[PDB]
């Protein structure tokens, strides 16, 4: 009766950062030793929680957010951060309580030609609220003239494609990111350790 962490981390494919997948985890006993004893992750930054102490307490719900970004944008997955990813694709609250986990995936997400399947939002009139998911494909209106759904002058497609190629530098290489969010509301606790 263990929680399905492997379905998220070890997934064959990952979603684009703008359409970041979220897996609600509840009513299961979670063993996190497979995570903090691992050696594959490049970054593992925990805010407000201690991964070693993960197999000791209880929570109401745990969220696993999956997406792919660049190496230069892994820094943007952190509370109080600013950037294209943190403002328009995936935002963490300042009071974030959880862990952000990333690892290099230049072998799974980089093709000889540009993968061009992972996308991110390039234009947005306002920043994203924390844990907000915007998957709109509406033509961005950069001027006062309406776009009517056709790209052109002052009318840009809000999404851009990551050019993941194996010959690029480490910063340009894709990184698969799984964000662990721990929710403890005044409700029966369903997620616990051993």
């Amino acid at each position, epitope marked *: 009766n263990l929680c399905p962490f492997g379905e998220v981390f070890n997934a064959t494919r990952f979603a684009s950062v703008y359409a970041w997948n979220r897996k609600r985890i509840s009513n299961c006993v979670a063993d996190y030793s497979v995570l903090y004893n691992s050696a594959s992750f490049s970054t593992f930054k925990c805010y407000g929680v201690s991964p070693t102490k993960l197999n000791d307490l209880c929570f109401t719900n745990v969220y696993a957010d999956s997406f792919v970004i660049r190496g*230069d944008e892994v820094r943007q997955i952190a509370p109080g951060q*600013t*950037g*294209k990813i943190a*403002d*328009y694709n995936y935002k963490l609250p300042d009071d974030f309580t959880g862990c952000v986990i990333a690892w290099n995936s230049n072998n799974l997400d980089s093709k000889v030609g540009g993968n061009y399947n992972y996308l991110y939002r*390039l*234009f*947005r*009139k*306002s*920043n994203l609220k924390p844990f907000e998911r915007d998957i709109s494909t509406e033509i*961005y*209106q*950069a*001027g*006062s003239t309406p776009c009517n759904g056709v790209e052109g*002058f*002052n009318c*840009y497609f809000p999404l*851009q494609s990551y*050019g993941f*190629q194996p*010959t*690029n*530098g480490v*910063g*340009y290489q894709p990184y698969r990111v799984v964000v662990l969010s721990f929710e403890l509301l005044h409700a029966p606790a369903t997620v616990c350790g051993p």
Partner: antibody
Amino acid sequence: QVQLVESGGGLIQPGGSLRLSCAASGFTVSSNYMSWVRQAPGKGLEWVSVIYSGGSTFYADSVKGRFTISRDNSKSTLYLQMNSLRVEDTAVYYCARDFGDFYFDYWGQGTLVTVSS
Amino acid sequence: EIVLTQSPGTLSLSPGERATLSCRASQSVSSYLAWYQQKPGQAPRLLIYGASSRATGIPDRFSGSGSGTDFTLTISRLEPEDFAVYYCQQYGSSPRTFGQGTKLEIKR
């Protein structure tokens, strides 16, 4: 049509403040990336600051803590406060319309900031 | 900090020839390169974006190339007004940086 007209350049003593304005026509400033690019007399182009469509601001290391980029949508003008200026900052500052923090598809005529005692 | 080293520093070609300009890179930037033309007394004008795409209003005689570190700007059918300082800009990693420039003269 797109217009970018600048103002505010002139002579300023080292340490003195100066504010550069850049009125824009042809697009909404609030919905676009905009950047300031300065070119030293006889030297190349250098990116200074950028303001995102969502309001986020980023600055170069040589101008952090001294320069500030802001916009006034009610006046369709992009501003650049400079505060603690230096003689090295003397350059022709250009107003550029940024396309997603990548490249500048439209440029202003540029204004000259001279810092000397 | 990534440095773009253009070459040659200057050139002198007669009208109607083909001008080739090289832009080197400290690190790979993929196809995230742009080209600008700055006539004397004027602001830079966008010429090439994405290292291959041509900006609106630009004649077909301009063309971009290069993949990750070595980039080439080729201008054919040279006209007396097509000559200025040409800059290359990368936008692969922050901060964005330009090149020192490459002047172009109209020989006579």
